[PDB]
Paper text:
Here we present the structure of mouse TRPC4 in its apo state at pH 7.5 at an overall resolution of 3.3 Å. In total, the TRPC4 structure is a four-fold symmetric homotetramer with dimensions of 100 Å × 100 Å × 120 Å. Each monomer consists of a transmembrane domain (TMD) and a compact cytosolic domain. The cytosolic domain of TRPC4 adopts a pedestal-like architecture. Compared to TRPM4, TRPC4’s selectivity filter is slightly more open, but the ion conduction pathway is restricted at its cytoplasmic interface, with Ile617, Asn621, and Gln625 at the bottom of S6 defining a lower gate. The narrowest constriction of the ion conduction pathway (3.6 Å) is formed by the S6 side chains of Asn621, while in TRPM4, the 5.1 Å wide lower gate is positioned at Ile1040. The simplest hypothesis, with these caveats in mind, is that TRPC4 is in a closed or inactivated state since the lower gate is too narrow to allow the passage of a fully or partially hydrated ion. A strong non-protein density peak in our TRPC4 structure is present in a hydrophilic pocket on the cytoplasmic side of the S1–S4 fold, consistent with the corresponding location of a presumed Ca2+ in TRPM421. We tentatively modeled this non-protein density as Na+ since sodium was the most abundant cation in our purification buffer. Eight densities corresponding to lipid molecules were clearly resolved and identified as cholesteryl hemisuccinates (CHS) and phospholipids (the density fitting ceramide-1-phosphate or phosphatidic acid).
Numbering used by the authors:
A (entry chain B): 706 to 755
B (entry chain A): 15 to 118, 134 to 174, 188 to 273, 285 to 388, 393 to 460, 463 to 665, 692 to 755
C (entry chain B): 505 to 655
D (entry chain C): 15 to 118, 134 to 174, 188 to 273, 285 to 388, 393 to 460, 463 to 660, 692 to 755
E (entry chain B): 152 to 174, 188 to 273, 285 to 302
Amino acid sequence: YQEVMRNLVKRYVAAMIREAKTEEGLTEENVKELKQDISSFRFEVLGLLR
Amino acid sequence: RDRIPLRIVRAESELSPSEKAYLNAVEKGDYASVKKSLEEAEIYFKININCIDPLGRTALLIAIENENLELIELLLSFNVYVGDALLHAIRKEVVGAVELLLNHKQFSEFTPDITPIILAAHTNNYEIIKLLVQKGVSVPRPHEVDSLRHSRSRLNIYKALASPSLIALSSEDPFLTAFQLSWELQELSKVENEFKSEYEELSRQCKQFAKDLLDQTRSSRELEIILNYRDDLARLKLAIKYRQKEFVAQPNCQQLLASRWYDEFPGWRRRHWAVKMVTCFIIGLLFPVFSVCYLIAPKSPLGLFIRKPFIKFICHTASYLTFLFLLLLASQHIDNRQGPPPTIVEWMILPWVLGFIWGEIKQMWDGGLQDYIHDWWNLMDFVMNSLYLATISLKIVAFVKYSNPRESWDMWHPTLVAEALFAIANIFSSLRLISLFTANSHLGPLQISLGRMLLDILKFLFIYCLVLLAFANGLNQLYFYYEETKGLSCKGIRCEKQNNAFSTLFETLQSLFWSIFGLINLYVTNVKAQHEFTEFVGATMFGTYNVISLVVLLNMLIAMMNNSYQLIADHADIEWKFARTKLWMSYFEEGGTLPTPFNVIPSPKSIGRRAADNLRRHHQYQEVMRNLVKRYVAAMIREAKTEEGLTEENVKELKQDISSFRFEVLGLLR
Amino acid sequence: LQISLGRMLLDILKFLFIYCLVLLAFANGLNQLYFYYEETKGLSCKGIRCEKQNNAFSTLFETLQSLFWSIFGLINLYVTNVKAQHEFTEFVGATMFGTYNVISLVVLLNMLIAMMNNSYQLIADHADIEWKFARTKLWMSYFEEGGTLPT
Amino acid sequence: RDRIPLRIVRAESELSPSEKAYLNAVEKGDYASVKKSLEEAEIYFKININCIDPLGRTALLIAIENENLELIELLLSFNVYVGDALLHAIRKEVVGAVELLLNHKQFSEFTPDITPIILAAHTNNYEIIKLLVQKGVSVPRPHEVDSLRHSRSRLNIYKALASPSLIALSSEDPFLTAFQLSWELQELSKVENEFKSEYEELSRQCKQFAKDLLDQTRSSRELEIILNYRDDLARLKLAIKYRQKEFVAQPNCQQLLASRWYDEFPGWRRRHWAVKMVTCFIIGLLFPVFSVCYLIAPKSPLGLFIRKPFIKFICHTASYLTFLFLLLLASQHIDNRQGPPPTIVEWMILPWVLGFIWGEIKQMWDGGLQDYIHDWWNLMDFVMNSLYLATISLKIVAFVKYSNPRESWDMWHPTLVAEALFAIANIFSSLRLISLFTANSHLGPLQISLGRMLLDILKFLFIYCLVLLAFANGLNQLYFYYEETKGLSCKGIRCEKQNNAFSTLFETLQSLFWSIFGLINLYVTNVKAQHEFTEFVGATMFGTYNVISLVVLLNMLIAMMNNSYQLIADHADIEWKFARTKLWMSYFEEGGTLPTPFNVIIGRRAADNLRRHHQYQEVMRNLVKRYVAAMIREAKTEEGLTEENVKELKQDISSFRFEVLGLLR
Amino acid sequence: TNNYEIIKLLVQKGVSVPRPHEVDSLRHSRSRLNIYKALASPSLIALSSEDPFLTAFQLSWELQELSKVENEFKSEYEELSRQCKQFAKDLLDQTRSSRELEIILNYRDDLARLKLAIKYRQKEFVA
Ligand SMILES: CCCCCCCCCCCCCCCC(=O)OC[C@H](COP(=O)(O)O)OC(=O)CCCCCCCCCCCCCCC
Ligand SMILES: CCCCCCCCCCCCCCCC(=O)OC[C@H](COP(=O)(O)O)OC(=O)CCCCCCCCCCCCCCC
Ligand SMILES: CCCCCCCCCCCCCCCC(=O)OC[C@H](COP(=O)(O)O)OC(=O)CCCCCCCCCCCCCCC
Ligand SMILES: CC(C)CCC[C@@H](C)[C@H]1CC[C@H]2[C@@H]3CC=C4C[C@@H](OC(=O)CCC(=O)O)CC[C@]4(C)[C@H]3CC[C@]12C
Ligand SMILES: CC(C)CCC[C@@H](C)[C@H]1CC[C@H]2[C@@H]3CC=C4C[C@@H](OC(=O)CCC(=O)O)CC[C@]4(C)[C@H]3CC[C@]12C
Ligand code: NA
Ligand code: NA
Ligand code: NA
């Protein structure tokens, strides 16, 4: 029974972590991530050319 | 104790920290660090290439989940354990699955029945399905001669075949595939009580796909090629046959059905409604005039004028109406144990009734008895015309072997049974005008919504019949001793005094049934003897019957019809129009057309061309379906964009497209 | 269907307590107004459950029977007469019986209809996952052995 | 003709193409091309700096809409016509408005009443409001001594004051500001039939803000400082006074109200319900025992035991119940034109009735008559106890000046009127047990949902009363000639024969009203004479009355109560709990407490005011701090990205592009 | 927050949760609701439980019968008990290939797990 529950908890956690993606809604803070990933990268490349 | 300890009960190794740095080199987009840490292999201490996280992620799943094709080319350049990372490249609709196709107990996340083309069809992506069909692939057929795999795998096969892209591709015509699949999925959902809401979902998907292929039909004649394709209007007959209620009312199909119903009235559907009432009134008045023609000269203006199917309806219904006015007129006449055929009225009746019987036998020749007994109005015609046969048979049997008491009759004397069955057949005959409502646009959807609440009422009256049997057994059991007064007529109930109400079981059923309404009084539950306890217990039983039947159950029936009528009125006007095209399309065929008395009588008063046409119609229809499948696939792939919802993994794409690019530019400046 | 009705029963039984307080209210009123002016102990039959319906609001128990049967159309208007000639107590007793009929038959009973509409819409969402639970209770009452011998 | 031509009817200049290239140099993020095309000015052929698109866009609005601060610094470095691009930097919640604050008929997009702090409060952004309050700013007061500007500007002022960030900042205590603003916006929505759904929206916003400030209360004693702040439980009395139905049921407030209602039963709310019925039964049975104490010794175990407000309820209601059992027992006794005080039963009654009258006058001393006549059960107590005064007054008047006919009385003889009013007062007295349901958790919300459908029923019975007047005028007008049989009693209706039904108007109203039910038969509409036409027209009038009243109107009343009960049952359990804390909180005060028959028979002030005042302001500093942090956290998780967020990222890639290409080329 | 990865990152270090039972008042009910809100999450039942079906069933029982105790916070403990009642149904949804189902529905510590599931009124586990 613990081996069967190892299988079920394994594929269940994989299933819900798959379903955390398809929520059809992006909070604004996701934009706060991408906007920094362009910004900090900018302040690295301008640190190498200047 | 005081705390509770938390230990990982189900634990793997998990990983080496160098391997954790290798999986941290992916998920960031490092084309440099992954290439170094992969070239450190074949030493090969100590990182294995095929390393697996505590949560899946076999090191090539990360290159797909974070959608990066260069790391897929780098990992497939080496020997990464692929199986089964092709399937993971299908859920995300990555079209890097080309690289998993053209090139190169372990916890599969998928049920092992899943082939690539089944999960390709589940995701409904047209491009990946076309990428697989160009290589293989085969789907197993579902039929047969330990149990979760069988129903699950059968539902994955039917779930894959019902997708509108393996019906767009890989089908001779997608209308037969959508119709027959919707039939097999509906009748398969009836078989398995389990998984009912999933096979109904797939049959609804197939029923919507055909409607959307009709939505892609521009420019009739492209519509008429579809709705005539015999392998008349054969595709609409075959569409009504498979109960495709959304295929009909395309609304492009209702213009073809509507113009063919009106052919060729110049602008009849634009006139004033009272002018429509006058024209339907005077065309309805001239129903012997148009219908003596088509017997004199079927090639004539009037003989071609009754071939108009709107002129068939009014006036089949006008002839039916004069039959009903004549049944009004039957009970206003003359008012003998053996009669004539009485009166002159019934001498006028006999061709109408023989016309309805010939109409029902003639209707059972072409079709039935499954499609005949499917509709309820035809069953009602069987009961009506059967009571007409019983009535005229007991009138003829009454004319023979009888001759004269005024009223002191046998009480089963065949004149009385003939009159009673004749009256019941007049109720069933004059309730047929409710079925004439589906032609009207205002009285139409109303009638069909009531007809769909009837099946939810009939499930409820069975419970009420058990309450009648319950309180009837109680009250009969309590009153068959204390109540039997056989000394004077009248007997009760249907009586001015209401004497013996709960004596027999049949009179008790009548007493409770009429006590639904306020038609049975309280002095009913007295005893002629003096027993106040049995009178009070009988009256309390009658009171709890009135509470359970009139306060509890009848208002539960009201609530049930509220919830049913709210579910029905969503799908009205796409289910009214289906029954309207059944009624319309019952008048398109020829002969057929002679209103009820004139159906049998001379009128009563009282070869390589077959292969050429098959290849011409066949290649013509396949060319039209090439156009429709082309613009339909373009339409749905357009509608996959405007979903107004971005999943989080889209951010997982852009965030890598900035990240990996970063680790390229820093690779060129440093 | 049966289980949705069985789940509306507990919302009905919360409602009949209010109605029982309306019966106690108008029963105390009508008994209090008619125990003087109405007591005819000279002839059987007594009323109610009677062809003449003689003494309806005399005692409290007969008043509860009179109002309860007057939910339905089974108790007539000549019930609220007095053998003596007092038109004011007859009119006040008939107005009390009229407001009883309005509160019970127009106000409360249609509020019970509305209550069962809102309850049956909440119940029918969770039907077929609550029918199947009671079906596996009924199924699983027959899995065990001995047990099995019909009554 | 055959076509229809389409010409721009409303046309500006529009622009020069060089100016179109200048506005195309912005909206792409060009820090180089904008700087060149701005340094080409003061030549100054031919681009003006203040150039305006066909769709607004005064060349600095583009630097805000596409959120770029370097072009705002570049344009504000030169002389761009700013007014009013500060306001456009507030809708988008750009915190580059600092640069429009610290530094530097023309189609304003905004109504000219809009100041920066009003539109700052409309967008509810805490940071921009704090950036403006540090500079000015003042809001006009709304009251007064051509007409769209007045109501629109008043609604913008109230719309700005009702925002939960000019109540978080800029208020002495935000609970009084939320309560008084919710009152002024509700009672202001009643004044103006127009704009009703907007002032109701703002009052709902104020009523939610106070509930969310209670949601930020952790760790009582922080709650009890709030709910005791007298400028008892003064803030809950003031919260019930302003009908803050969501403030109550915080649900943190129901624990404070619930423990104070139970003080101090060890775990009463965990026991079995039948054990609760036994304890309430035997405590309800001993109501003279606990209530003779607090008259003997109010400092005693039993004298402090009736000070428990749950022990006040049961047993005020137990004393009320023995009054009702005794009214059951009144009609089972002895069964004279002049009586005693009859019987011994009423000799027992008089202290209960004088107790209720003293309870209602005592209730009208502390409060009312607005808050007294607001609740309907108190009005019902006024009618009940008034009929008790009329009853005992006609019994005393009956004892004097009378002495003996058995039944042949005056028909307005005061014994009969005393008995009739006594019976009506027993109906109104024993319908009070329905008001005892709000203490119960199962019978509670049901009673209040019915009580909220009553006001929608009473709007409907006015239409029905007009249908009664209509068909009553018709049927009386048709039958006052052909029907008047004054030759034999009984008269009809309330009669075995039902003789004269439509003779007079009052009997016609009785005939139609009883013909709602199946209590009036068809032979009612006959004439003693032989006129079949007037009998058929009278019967058709009675038939259309039965169709309009019993098929049309009564099922419309059913449908009306369906739509009303679906709207009511959403806001149940936050409106049951409000009336439950009214009922609970009617028993918290002292004296007060004696069940119905037994009711009659200095610098330290400045130190306590500064201590309570600074303590409460410290607690409100904590709550406003963590509340503003909470709502600014909830501004993120909205699950919806507007398109203009894409207009930000797309510029952050674009302008960066036009910087890197400026360094490699 | 129900994130499986961060919970596994913490369980590898400590951590302990206090037990809820007992022998000024907002902290007690709030902290008890945070403890039951943490134990009812489907990732501290996925990790850190002997079998998650008994933990989901017994937690759904204690949260339902705990929502009956406290009239306040009723709609939050009912929400958590509904969360536990859904977690068990989703673990049955992850069962492929009976015999994997019959091992679950027979585990006596007949069909003992269905009798124990009907006993705890798990109406969604069944069906
Ligand atoms: C059981 C399957 C069907 C569905 C389940 C039904 C739920 C259970 C039904 C409850 C039983 C009915 C009550 C008992 C009948 C009865 O008392 O009838 C028995 C008698 C009625 O008069 P008799 O005694 O003269 O017969 O009760 C009395 O003696 C008079 C006092 C009782 C007053 C009844 C109060 C109950 C309220 C019912 C009316 C509600 C009206 C709604 C409008 C506001
Ligand atoms: C109180 C807790 C329960 C819920 C609260 C109930 C709300 C209050 C109920 C209002 C009181 C009832 C009205 C008074 C009864 C009465 O008049 O009854 C008293 C008498 C009735 O005839 P008698 O006088 O002969 O008794 O009124 C009359 O004299 C005749 C003229 C009155 C016409 C009544 C008009 C009121 C409309 C009620 C019928 C609505 C039918 C709905 C279908 C369209
Ligand atoms: C007007 C403001 C109020 C709201 C508006 C009301 C809408 C208009 C009402 C329509 C008028 C009522 C119909 C006329 C009454 C009448 O005919 O009553 C008049 C008589 C009734 O019998 P008498 O003739 O003996 O009086 O009609 C007849 O002669 C018998 C044949 C007529 C059959 C009536 C058919 C109408 C259907 C009404 C019953 C519906 C039952 C619903 C359950 C299925
Ligand atoms: C028993 C005798 C006394 C007849 C009494 C009934 C008739 C007066 C009514 C009842 C139903 C009515 C019918 C209801 C519906 C229709 C369909 C309707 O036909 C249409 O809507 C035309 C089609 C279109 O509108 O495109 C009008 C005729 C008809 C037969 C109506 C004709 C008159 C009918 C038979
Ligand atoms: C069933 C018919 C015959 C009516 C019976 C009349 C009385 C015996 C009933 C009518 C209303 C009942 C009351 C309805 C509501 C309440 C509130 C309820 O009090 C509580 O719920 C305690 C508060 C809490 O539970 O926290 C129980 C007592 C009481 C007065 C009940 C006491 C018994 C009463 C008076
Ligand atoms: Na037929
Ligand atoms: Na009736
Ligand atoms: Na009071």
